[PDB]
């Protein structure tokens, strides 16, 4: 059994010559040489079986990634685990090795307008497919956008993904939220559980703004600072936009704030393409009902060089009840879901 840093990384014999990357939520990550396809790959060790919440996340992401097949979404190439439920303590997920991610790129590299445009197109092309399967990503951010050396972009980390549920999207003011703060839509802090597609378009808008400047646009330092950051740029919500916020704690909080005027996008981003700013404005709309949809974004003049609906596939099999399953049942479903990778 191959070791790495005194931890078992039992992946062989297909996957040889390992190297440590880092930690992920339920275990460690390494690269390795695939000896069938003759290219190096990434492998995540996952060990979720003691905790039902970890089982649900693992099973949900396996189910989603195996259902999906899209150029701009990370695939599962292989899954390694024991032949029996009783011997299965760990699962190893094998994926394409991607040289970098958009977070690392933004820390280190100036992006040309052509790079921005092409990355944005690929994000939206992948998202169109996700949304067409009735799935929400809910944690889109630069570190979840992987890139290889030819600038192919793949969306990853479906650990917070959910089937869309706009009918049950309402909640009270300051409801706790799982996804990364700086890319959360304003409504998360006000009255939304993040069960509609508009949550993802906001996060894309944040990523576009970050690409234009190499810096996060709304780097909130806590839950309500994330909103005071949003309103210092967008300006105070209009009365019309406030008519949507029926919850009094959320309404009255917004009403208590000093009036702020909109900061023009062209002043924040003086070297940006004017069509990029128009599209940015439409993604970063305070009111989620007025926020642009993925297909409208793809069809925006900024992306005209790329837009091709016949080459922007939709899911064949959209997701049309894991919360209250015990961890023992979830282990069984993870076993069943991973059965297709077993030698046979």
Swiss-Prot record:
Effect listed in the UniProt record for changing residue 177 to A: Inhibits interaction with TPR
Compartments reported by the entry? Cytoplasm, Cytoskeleton, Spindle; Nucleus; Cytoplasm, Cytoskeleton, Microtubule organizing center, Centrosome; Cytoplasm
Q: Name one GO molecular function term.
A: phosphotyrosine residue binding
- Result when mutating residue 308 to A: Loss of dephosphorylation by PTPRJ
Q: How is it modified after translation?
A: Phosphorylated upon KIT and FLT3 signaling. Dually phosphorylated on Thr-175 and Tyr-177, which activates the enzyme. Undergoes regulatory phosphorylation on additional residues such as Ser-236 and Ser-238 in the kinase insert domain (KID) These phosphorylations, which are probably mediated by more than one kinase, are important for binding of MAPK1/ERK2 to importin-7 (IPO7) and its nuclear translocation. In addition, autophosphorylation of Thr-180 was shown to affect the subcellular localization of MAPK1/ERK2 as well. Ligand-activated ALK induces tyrosine phosphorylation.
The record's Gene Ontology biological-process terms are:
apoptotic process; B cell receptor signaling pathway; Bergmann glial cell differentiation; cardiac neural crest cell development involved in heart development; caveolin-mediated endocytosis; cell surface receptor signaling pathway; cellular response to amino acid starvation; cellular response to tumor necrosis factor
What's the subunit arrangement here? Binds both upstream activators and downstream substrates in multimolecular complexes. This interaction inhibits its tyrosine-kinase activity. Interacts with ADAM15, ARHGEF2, ARRB2, DAPK1 (via death domain), HSF4, IER3, IPO7, NISCH, SGK1, and isoform 1 of NEK2. Interacts (via phosphorylated form) with TPR (via C-terminal region and phosphorylated form); the interaction requires dimerization of MAPK1/ERK2 and increases following EGF stimulation. Interacts with MAP2K1. Interacts with DUSP6.
In Swiss-Prot or TrEMBL terms, this protein is called Mitogen-activated protein kinase 1
Q: Which organism is it from?
A: Homo sapiens
Record gene name: MAPK1
């Amino acid at each position: 059994p191959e070791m790495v840093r005194g931890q078992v990384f039992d992946v062989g014999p297909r996957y040889t010559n390992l190297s440590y990357i880092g930690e992920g939520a339920y275990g460690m990550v390494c690269s390795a040489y695939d000896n069938v396809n003759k290219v190096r790959v990434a492998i995540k060790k996952i060990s979720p079986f003691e905790h039902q919440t970890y089982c649900q996340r693992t099973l949900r992401e396996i189910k989603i990634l195996l259902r999906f097949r899209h150029e701009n979404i990370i695939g599962i190439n292989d899954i390694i685990r024991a032949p029996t439920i009783e011997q299965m303590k760990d699962v190893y997920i094998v994926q394409d090795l991607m040289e970098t991610d958009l977070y690392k790129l933004l820390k280190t590299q100036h992006l040309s307008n052509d790079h921005i445009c092409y990355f944005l197109y690929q994000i939206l092309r992948g998202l169109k497919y996700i949304h067409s399967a009735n799935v929400l990503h809910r944690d889109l951010k630069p570190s979840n956008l992987l890139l290889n050396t030819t600038c192919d972009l793949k969306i990853c980390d479906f650990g917070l993904a959910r089937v869309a549920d706009p009918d049950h999207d309402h909640t009270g003011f300051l409801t706790e939220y799982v996804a990364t703060r700086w890319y959360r839509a304003p409504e998360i802090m006000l009255n939304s559980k993040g069960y509609t597609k508009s949550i993802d378009i906001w996060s894309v808008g944040c990523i576009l703004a970050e690409m234009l400047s190499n810096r996060p646009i709304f780097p909130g330092k806590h839950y309500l600072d994330q909103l005071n950051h949003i309103l210092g740029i967008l300006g105070s919500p209009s009365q019309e936009d406030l008519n949507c916020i029926i919850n009094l704690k959320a309404r009255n909080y917004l009403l208590s704030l000093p009036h702020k005027n909109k900061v023009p996008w062209n002043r924040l981003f003086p070297n940006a393409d004017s069509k990029a700013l128009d599209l940015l404005d439409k993604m970063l709309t305070f009111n989620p009902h007025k926020r642009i949809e993925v297909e409208q974004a793809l069809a925006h003049p900024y992306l005209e060089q790329y837009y091709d609906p016949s080459d922007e596939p939709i899911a064949e099999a959209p997701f049309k009840e894991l919360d209250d399953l015990p961890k023992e049942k979830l282990k069984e479903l993870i076993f069943e879901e991973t059965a297709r990778f077993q030698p046979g």
